[PDB]
Amino acid sequence: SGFRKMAFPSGKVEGCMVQVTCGTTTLNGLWLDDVVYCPRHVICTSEDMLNPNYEDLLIRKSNHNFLVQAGNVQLRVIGHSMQNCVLKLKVDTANPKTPKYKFVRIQPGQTFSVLACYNGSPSGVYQCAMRPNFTIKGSFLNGSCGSVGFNIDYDCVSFCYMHHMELPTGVHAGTDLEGNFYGPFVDRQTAQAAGTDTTITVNVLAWLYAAVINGDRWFLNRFTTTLNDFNLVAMKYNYEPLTQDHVDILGPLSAQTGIAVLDMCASLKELLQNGMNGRTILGSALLEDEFTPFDVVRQCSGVTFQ
Amino acid sequence: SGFRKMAFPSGKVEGCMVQVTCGTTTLNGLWLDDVVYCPRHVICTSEDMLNPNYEDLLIRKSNHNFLVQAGNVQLRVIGHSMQNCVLKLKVDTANPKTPKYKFVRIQPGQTFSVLACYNGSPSGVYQCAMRPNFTIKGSFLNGSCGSVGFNIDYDCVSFCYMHHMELPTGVHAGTDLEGNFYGPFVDRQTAQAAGTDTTITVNVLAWLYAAVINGDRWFLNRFTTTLNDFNLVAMKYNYEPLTQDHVDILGPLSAQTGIAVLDMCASLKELLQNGMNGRTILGSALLEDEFTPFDVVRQCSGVTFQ
Ligand SMILES: *C(=N)[C@H](C[C@@H]1CCNC1=O)NC(=O)[C@@H]1[C@@H]2[C@H](CN1C(=O)[C@@H](NC(=O)C(F)(F)F)C(C)(C)C)C2(C)C
């Protein structure tokens, strides 16, 4: 019993974190094989960040202008390249601690762990979801850029995010490990709108199934609904539309509890239309949308990694 | 900006996890130097756990009856000892991955990270607090016993908890690394009461200061209070009494925000007496008590570890 926001063990990623300095700007880098990946704004001064021309700024930088430090030991930079919004520094030493890894571009609604770092050193780990508006609700201060988001499948680390900036609503923006931003964000210090933040409906339903498995089922009502009638209600509350693909993904949890997805949709509708009346679900007074159906199955089954 | 429940990076602890089997029971062990620490109920069958006499049960066990596995390699057990509710297995190999460590017995209200494990392998990491009633609100399934709680001060791991059992209210119980239970719990499968769960007042105040630092300050009112008048209200809501020691611990946060602790107490009083009226604080619809004043300072300052 019990249900908590759980991050993946971070040991494999800790061994990949390095500190990257260019001039007076220092941030975090990810050292995998003989390449160090970092946000390209490491080459910017505070002034440059207002309206940077990254191509012109980078042209005045040579290999020796990038200091890469792993603990107390300096890595020698033998090449550099800009790939979208990430800078790749080729070093003369392959990271001996490189785990089995892949680079992935996740979809909105999917979750991942973040190892927040400062000056190349680990500070902490937490679980995030890519919001439907391509922002994340993290905790990042100045110097946290370069910190990465990842998932782990047994012994393989799938890197999916690199932190770049904070938007005016307090939420965060970043890229995949090919340097392409999630969302319409740009790496420039200018006013940027995130857009309406919608609730990840399939995740809320997954979390309601987690509540049932844990014995918390006061919210289960005597009604059922249809996909179209549920979506008419969901769209009023800025909930993402539910599709037959989401219904299928919920299949294991539906079969475990004996509760049809459309019956759970009717209980969700009543929670949206009536609130929780001072009550809680899994110790929460709000409907939680940062647990995917996979996260629920994993935590309820005790899936382990190498 | 942003405020999340953050766990310590788990790499140093991952390198210490082993699998311990005795007969048909398998659980997690912690391998530090040439000793493996694990819950003594590893020697029990399902039947034994109803009313065990650990001393008689252990007397029928020899070194060769304990299989200790680190990954795929078997460790040789050359000695065994029962210390309160933990079993210590002396092995012939010192763990090469042993970090700098200490064993500590934490106080109620203090927080720590848990690396939940199954069969000696890491599953995930989350942050917990030792409740005033000496229970934790974790997420543990059968086989998670032996998983540990720890804090990290730069490069030193302070182990403070080892998981043993789940109480009927869904909360968990365990020991320090000397095998002494936190609370009045015993390692026997019998009805056990946790006692009233009170709110960690100094932690709620710390989290209110975190909200202010992050720009979330709708709740700040025009009132102040006294320690005795606040405590008369707090005790009605099952809040722990606030002392001058707690006021002093809040000092850095009080000085950073310019908000006196007694002024913050008056705003807390109004939140307890009026609720939050459908509003949230740091994305939460309840008053959060699992962030100590130290956790707030650390997350707001970006403290890092080796
Ligand atoms: C990199 N270490 C920081 C991390 C920021 C600092 C506060 N919390 C974070 O996540 N990244 C930046 O400073 C980036 C950087 C220039 C400006 N910047 C911002 O995050 C700014 N944001 C924006 O201008 C906005 F709103 F468009 F997102 C800031 C105002 C400082 C929060 C570049 C190159 C994008």
Ligand SMILES: *C(=N)[C@H](C[C@@H]1CCNC1=O)NC(=O)[C@@H]1[C@@H]2[C@H](CN1C(=O)[C@@H](NC(=O)C(F)(F)F)C(C)(C)C)C2(C)C
């Ligand atoms: C060890 N792997 C498990 C972990 C439990 C299983 C469910 N979630 C957990 O945290 N520990 C146990 O099975 C311990 C073990 C015997 C009984 N037990 C319990 O946790 C039981 N609890 C109690 O009897 C109670 F209420 F007193 F706490 C159980 C009913 C199985 C939840 C021993 C030796 C204490």
